[PDB]
């Protein structure tokens, strides 16, 4: 009974960062595809309006990543290895709560709560 689409690997994610500096967000996935054309959401914000989903390497106006300004670099080069690395600049003491890591493998989707830590 193969009902396993794609899953997450590793841990929830205790990601450590420095305020104003660079936040390297790391998520591990085990998809059936290379996930290059897949959709990912790797951010934290309050209420469903900003931070929705960024896809294929293309931004989404309705996702408005402009919420974290132009300080966003989603390393998708790793995605073929099952790793996504979001470099977000200027982490804050409110932002270091739990980052919402969401992976969308075509029709499949998985969730993860990455607890940030300002060290």
């Amino acid at each position: 009974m193969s009902s396993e689409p794609f899953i997450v690997n590793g841990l929830e994610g205790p990601v450590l960062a420095s305020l104003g500096g660079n936040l390297e967000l790391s998520c591990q996935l085990s998809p059936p595809q290379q996930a290059q054309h897949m959709e990912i959401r790797w951010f934290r914000n309050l209420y469903t309006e900003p931070v929705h989903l960024y896809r294929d390497g293309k931004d989404m106006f309705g996702e408005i990543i402009s919420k974290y300004v132009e300080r966003t670099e989603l390393l998708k080069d790793g995605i073929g290895e099952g790793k996504v690395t979001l470099r977000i600049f200027n982490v804050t003491v409110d932002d270091d709560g739990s980052y919402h890591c969401v992976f969308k493998d075509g029709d499949f989707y998985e969730e993860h709560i990455t607890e940030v830590k300002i060290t």
Side-chain angles (χ1 to χ4, degrees):
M1 186 134 164
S2 340
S3 344
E4 7 283 306
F6 97 99
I7 43 118
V8 200
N9 228 287
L11 320 102
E12 245 17 75
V15 272
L16 310 113
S18 328
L19 302 138
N22 170 59
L23 217 197
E24 245 183 76
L25 281 322
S26 342
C27 254
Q28 253 101 111
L29 30 93
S30 324
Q33 312 287 299
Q34 28 123 52
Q36 159 245 339
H37 225 117
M38 273 55 205
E39 307 133 24
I40 174 188
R41 174 216 223 160
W42 220 145
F43 328 98
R44 182 225 61 130
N45 221 246
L46 248 303
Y47 284 107
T48 348
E49 218 219 309
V51 174
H52 266 134
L53 179 90
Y54 132 93
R55 58 241 217 279
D56 190 38
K58 281 248 125 263
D59 105 297
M60 196 211 156
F61 200 63
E63 112 105 5
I64 189 105
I65 183 55
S66 341
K67 210 66 206 143
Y68 228 116
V69 214
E70 58 260 328
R71 274 137 231 161
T72 359
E73 169 54 36
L74 208 2
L75 220 80
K76 243 202 181 229
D77 147 74
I79 213 158
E81 253 234 33
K83 285 105 157 217
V84 262
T85 345
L86 167 96
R87 297 129 111 278
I88 248 174
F89 235 86
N90 178 63
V91 62
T92 19
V93 85
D94 150 67
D95 222 72
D96 88 308
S98 12
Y99 251 62
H100 228 63
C101 198
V102 182
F103 341 85
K104 272 213 70 246
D105 189 86
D107 214 48
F108 313 136
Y109 58 88
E110 243 314 310
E111 256 212 339
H112 238 51
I113 22 136
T114 344
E115 27 170 317
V116 210
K117 272 254 297 263
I118 304 301
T119 343

